[PDB]
């Protein structure tokens, strides 16, 4: 008729403890932006994003 499974009891989260505050303001709060004919790319990695 039915199925029997055990529901979870609590919740656990685990993130890496690296904290470097990814430079979103460097690409957002910048004075000059490149044109559409020649677009620039910046790689963001190994930090924490908000």
């Amino acid at each position: 008729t039915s199925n029997f499974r055990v529901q979870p009891t609590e919740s656990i989260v685990r993130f890496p403890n690296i904290t470097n505050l990814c430079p979103f303001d460097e690409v957002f709060n910048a004075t000059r932006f490149a044109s559409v004919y020649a677009w620039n790319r910046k790689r963001i990695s190994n930090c924490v994003a908000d």
Binding site: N3, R5, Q7, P8
Partner: protein, 49 residues
């Protein structure tokens, strides 16, 4: 004039392992959206079981 007795094999299958599936768990583990979708469909896989 002379007779001999010989034996031969003959193999016939009988049955396989009986298998039963479940509608809810095979679709997803513990998501209630699967249950809501299968209820608003109606009955599609109960006859399969």
């Amino acid at each position: 004039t002379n007779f001999t007795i010989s034996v031969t094999t003959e193999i016939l299958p009988v049955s396989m392992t009986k298998t039963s599936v479940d509608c809810t768990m095979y679709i997803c583990g513990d998501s209630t959206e699967c249950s809501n979708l299968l209820l608003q469909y109606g009955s599609f896989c109960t006859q399969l079981k």
